[PDB]
Amino acid sequence: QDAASGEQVFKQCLVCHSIGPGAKNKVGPVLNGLFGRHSGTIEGFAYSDANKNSGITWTEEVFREYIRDPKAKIPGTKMIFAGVKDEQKVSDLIAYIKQFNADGSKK
Ligand code: HEC
Known part of the structure; x- marks a missing residue:
């Protein structure tokens, strides 16, 4: 789906996660x-x-199953985050994350 839309969805993730060039580990x-x-x-x-x-x-x-309910797929995980329930947001979220290579560069 829409990468540009996925970028807005990713903002809730950005607080703890980094992506793109120069990304470093955080929470x-x-x-x-x-x-x-x-x-x-x-x-x-x-x-x-x-x-x-x-x-x-x-x-x-x-x-997709995990982001919907993290603690349900990985009980005891440190990612205390409610999850993304919206079907459309997840598809856009996936489209956004998929643009990146392991080094942060865009495919
Ligand atoms: C901090 C409050 C977070 C928010 C908001 C999101 N994530 Fe997260 N994530 C966080 C932690 C502490 C960890 C490690 C959990 C553990 O038990 O060690 C993670 C992990 C993930 C993973 C798995 C990574 C891997 O196995 O290498 C994924 C795929 C992941 N988180 C994705 C993700 C997305 C897409 C989010 C926004 C919807 C998101 N996280 C938010 C902390 C936090």
Whole structure:
């Protein structure tokens, strides 16, 4: 869907997460090159066991179920965030995050 719209959705994430060039870890891990990556593997971040040992691989499908209700998909996770319930927002959110390569550069 719409990346430009996803950027506005991402603003709730921006508080804890960084994306794009020069992104660094904050309260949450950097989200550059998220899709396809295994959960709990961004270097330098202190993940909870819940996240680190979950065995999840981030695909669009799994990401959509997770962002809807984080604590439901990863009980005990440190990401105390309510989640994004809107079907359209999630699709735009995905479109926005997918533009980035692991190094922050735009595809
Ligand atoms: C701080 C109050 C956060 C907000 C708002 C959002 N996220 Fe977050 N996220 C945060 C933490 C502390 C962590 C680590 C959790 C843990 O248990 O260690 C995370 C993690 C994620 C992950 C998994 C990352 C990975 O496995 O490498 C994802 C995919 C993620 N968060 C995405 C995300 C999005 C898209 C958000 C806005 C809708 C969002 N988070 C908000 C902290 C915070």
